[PDB]
Design a protein around this nucleic acid. Sequence first.
DNA 1: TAATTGAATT
DNA 2: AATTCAATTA
Lengths: 57, 57
Amino acid sequence: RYRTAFTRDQLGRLEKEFYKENYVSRPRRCELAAQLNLPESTIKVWFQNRRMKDKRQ
Amino acid sequence: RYRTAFTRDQLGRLEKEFYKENYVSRPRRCELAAQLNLPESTIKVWFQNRRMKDKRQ
DNA sequence: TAATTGAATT
DNA sequence: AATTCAATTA
């Protein structure tokens, strides 16, 4: 299926963004993507999964 | 964390099942678990790992 | 190498 | 939201 291994700078940035807001829109994810050098799709899915994780805990 | 230690006939039975089919459904797994006195989850995880082995080396 | 983690799928 | 399976970790 895949395997994106985020580096601590990417996951670290992602986690800072998640706690200010558990949801990010397409333009914003595009912004994070250019900045993070990752596909938009990758960021979308991470937020989806992070919301799920958060729900359980 | 962990660690389960298989008996020789438990693993031979596992390896036998695997050569016939690399995947067993949730209900066959319960049949094997009853028969081998091992946990349902243990067998699920073993097929997970054995497939990774087959797929990789 | 058994068990866990989490990225991707559906 | 529920599962799967590619990677670790111990």
